[PDB]
Design a protein around this nucleic acid. Structure first.
Ligand SMILES: [Zn+2]
Lengths: 78, 154, 60, 99, 128, 112
RNA sequence: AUUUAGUUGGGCACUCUAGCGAGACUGCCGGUGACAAACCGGAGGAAGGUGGGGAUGACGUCAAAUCAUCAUGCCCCUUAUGACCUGGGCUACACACGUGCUACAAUGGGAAGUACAACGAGUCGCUAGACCGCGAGGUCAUGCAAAUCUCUUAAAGCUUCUCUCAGUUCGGAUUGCAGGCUGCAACUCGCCUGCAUGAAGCCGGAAUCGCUAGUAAUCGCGGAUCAGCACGCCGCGGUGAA
């Protein structure tokens, strides 16, 4: 319930932008907690940070609604 | 309890029948302090009494007391590490309390759909040697005197 | 590990949900009456000396 | 008429002694003062557990008690206003005047 | 005309009985007898002082009750009426003291204790 | 068999018997009975062929299906098969806001 | 008299508010008792046998608990076991134990209409009224630093219909979808609403717990800490037992 639209920080935007007409980069080091996904963020490759490790994951177009917090499982049950 | 005997709390009579016995009858139905619902369903039970074989609204309750009320009960009065329970005459107020218990507190088990057919017709049945609470007293007297010889000397 | 933290809590906060409550003369994080800015037990100690106006014992 | 005051303190003895003093000075140059109307005297409680580390099964509490009185004045003189501004003490009660 | 006074209290509920020579009814908070007093059978409950003094009427009763629960504020009606019947004639005070209905029930809700569940109920405490 | 989907039984009235299918709570039932102009009828279902066909066609205006079960399956199939962290614990039946369970498995599996 | 209405004219009559006061002490009589302490009844009264509760905890016991409220004898660390910031975690789960909440339905569920409390809180805090919404609620706004304005018209209550003994119109967990609110931000990890879903569970062995009357049992309400979050804690009141 975030009735006034999505929420993505502006200190997430500042790594690269010129990968819009070219083949994208591989390094996206971040914190990857607060920001959700809205369709301008499709098909990148982000090192999602889980408190210890910026774990790399790339994007499908239907991995689209939830935040960057599904893909930082901080439990380590193995 | 330990020191001496305790007081016994005589009660108030009814607002209609002016009876302490029917008042005590209401008070051994009452759950969670809902007195008016139990009192009103007992007046409804008297209305079911008055219609189907209406004889007397209170004599049917006194005959329900007739066919239930005990006279005997065993009590474990051992002396020197034994098991010689003695069939002992019961106090008269405890006698009536056991009668009310055997009438109402057994009437949970009729299981009929109408919610006071387990009450009104149940105390109709106890007036004339029917209802299983009579045979409760019968088997109670039969398990009494099972040590009639080796316990009545104490 | 608190002499830096008491000076940390005298500063204006980074944002709104950081200025919590602790005691003044001690530094307890839990069970501080915000009407008095005292903890549970320094209040108890000063309550007997007649040094807090208002407060008496309570029997009823 | 154009004056009514309030009394709020902690001890009713200081309350009604200062109230009797100001009733004594009330109809000095004026007239028709209304008496000490009582008020329902708000009260608080608290709860402090009698330990430092454990033992919540034994506790302790205190109380705040705020006694309140009330004195009304009907049809006053102008001379009592400068008289009551010369009346300032005791300090245990705090007055609350209007016009 | 003249009116007869009386007051009765029970269970944190207060009543102001106003007895008048009437026909035998009660008006409470400017309503009828059993509009504001609900389905409960508490008529001869209230008319029990009438069964020992001036049976059964015929005096209408004004009262303005407030506070407490319904049965407690009903029981307080009994005592303003009996106080009024003492106000009318001295010759019934023996008949009231044999019947009671004059002593105020001083018994009300008990103070708790900080440390239990209730005023006397203790919590479960497993021995092993 | 019976009139829509399967098994609309008699001996109960209309708002009761229609609850028996996968897709009717109680608000759907009252709104569908309001869309025709019908009543409880009565405590046994004794409707007429006009009424049964009307309430048959109005249910077809909804998602009331046996593929509504398949609709739930494709919902949770979308859920569990992206990554998915919610699939790992979805099969272990703990909600997406968390419930922090070390003895609440007896709801689903009964580990005793 | 008036007005919807104790409102406005008026009174302090009743109630209430709370200061100063009176009142219950074996006080009188009768029996029991060595005639003594004392025990049992009676009259009077609001309560008669320390009227009902609370605060109040001796000598001492257990090297019981506390350096993690505080102070501190001694010992150790000091470009660091000290300090700043981001993100995570104390909220995991193959398991066993303790404490509470909700049910296993007919003294009941569901729908309709219909009454009576007490304590306390309120300035960046409680919201009157109005409009709209299935709702959590949204907007304009009026009173309120207080016996006045709000929280707030309490639930069990009462009258009609209903269902007809079923794993059920009992039950209400689990799960998709849609939302609402404070927070810079509800994934890890807040609460609440609506739709769709509907599991166990028909009174629980051995054993074990609390309680002698406004108590036990049931039902609501307020407060602390608090942007937000309570089945916990503290307090009050209704019905009222064996
Ligand atoms: Zn302190």
């Amino acid at each position: 319930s975030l009735k006034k639209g999505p929420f993505v920080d502006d200190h997430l935007m500042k790594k690269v932008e010129a990968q819009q007409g070219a083949e994208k980069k591989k390094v996206i080091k971040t914190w990857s907690r607060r920001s959700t996904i809205f369709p301008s963020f499709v098909g990148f490759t982000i090192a999602v940070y889980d408190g210890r490790k910026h774990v790399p994951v790339y994007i499908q177009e239907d991995m689209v609604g939830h935040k960057l917090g599904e893909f930082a499982p901080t439990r380590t049950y193995r | 309890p330990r020191k001496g005997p305790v007081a016994k709390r005589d009660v108030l009579p009814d607002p209609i029948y002016n009876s302490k016995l029917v008042t005590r009858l209401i008070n051994r139905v009452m759950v969670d302090g809902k007195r008016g619902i139990a009192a009103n369903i007992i007046y409804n039970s008297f209305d079911i009494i008055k219609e189907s074989t209406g004889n007397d609204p209170l004599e049917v309750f006194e005959q329900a007391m007739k066919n239930v009320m005990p006279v005997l009960e065993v009590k474990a009065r051992r002396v020197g590490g034994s098991n010689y329970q003695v069939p002992v005459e019961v106090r008269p107020e405890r006698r009536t309390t056991l009668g009310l218990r055997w009438v109402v507190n057994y009437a949970r088990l009729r299981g009929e759909h109408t919610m006071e057919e387990r009450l009104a017709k149940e105390i109709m049945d106890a007036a004339n040697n029917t209802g299983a609470s009579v045979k409760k007293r019968e088997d109670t007297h039969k398990m009494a005197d099972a040590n009639r010889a080796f316990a009545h000397y104490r | 590990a608190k002499k830096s933290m008491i000076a940390k809590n005298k500063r204006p906060a980074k944002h709104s949900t950081q200025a919590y409550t602790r005691c003044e003369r001690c530094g307890r994080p839990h069970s501080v009456y915000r009407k008095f800015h005292l903890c549970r037990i320094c209040f108890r100690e000063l309550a007997y000396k007649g040094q807090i106006p208002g407060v008496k014992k309570a029997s009823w | 008429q154009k004056i009514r005051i309030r009394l709020k303190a902690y001890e009713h003895r200081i309350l009604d002694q200062s109230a009797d003093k100001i009733v004594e000075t009330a109809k000095r140059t004026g007239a028709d003062v209304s008496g000490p109307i009582p008020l329902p005297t708000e009260r608080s409680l608290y709860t402090v557990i009698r330990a430092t580390h454990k033992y919540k099964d034994s506790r302790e509490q205190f109380e705040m008690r705020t006694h309140k009185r009330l004195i009304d004045i009907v049809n006053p003189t102008p001379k009592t206003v400068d008289a009551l501004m010369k009346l300032d003490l005791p300090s245990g009660v705090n007055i609350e005047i209007k016009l | 005309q003249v009116q007869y006074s009386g007051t009765g209290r029970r269970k944190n509920a207060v009543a102001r009985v106003r007895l008048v020579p009437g026909t035998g009814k009660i008006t409470v908070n400017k309503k009828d007898v059993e509009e504001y007093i609900p389905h409960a059978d508490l008529r001869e409950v209230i008319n029990q002082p009438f069964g020992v003094t001036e049976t059964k009427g015929a005096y209408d009763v004004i009262v303005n009750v407030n506070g407490g629960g319904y049965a407690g504020q009903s029981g307080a009606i009994r005592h303003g009426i009996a106080r009024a019947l003492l106000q009318v004639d001295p010759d019934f005070r023996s008949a009231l003291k044999r019947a009671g209905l004059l002593t105020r029930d001083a018994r009300m809700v008990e103070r708790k204790k900080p440390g239990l569940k209730k005023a006397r109920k203790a919590s479960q405490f497993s021995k092993r | 068999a019976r009139i829509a989907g399967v098994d609309i039984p008699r001996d109960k009235r209309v708002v009761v018997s229609l609850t028996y299918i996968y897709g009717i709570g109680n608000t759907t039932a009252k709104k569908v009975l309001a869309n025709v102009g019908v009543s409880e009828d009565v405590r046994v279902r004794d409707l007429t062929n006009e009424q049964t066909d009307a309430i048959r066609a109005e249910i077809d205006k909804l998602k009331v299906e046996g593929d509504l079960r398949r609709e739930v399956n494709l919902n949770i199939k979308r859920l569990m098969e992206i990554g998915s962290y919610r699939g790992i614990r979805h099969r272990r039946g703990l909600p997406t806001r968390g419930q922090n369970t070390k003895n609440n498995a007896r709801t689903r599996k009964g580990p005793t």
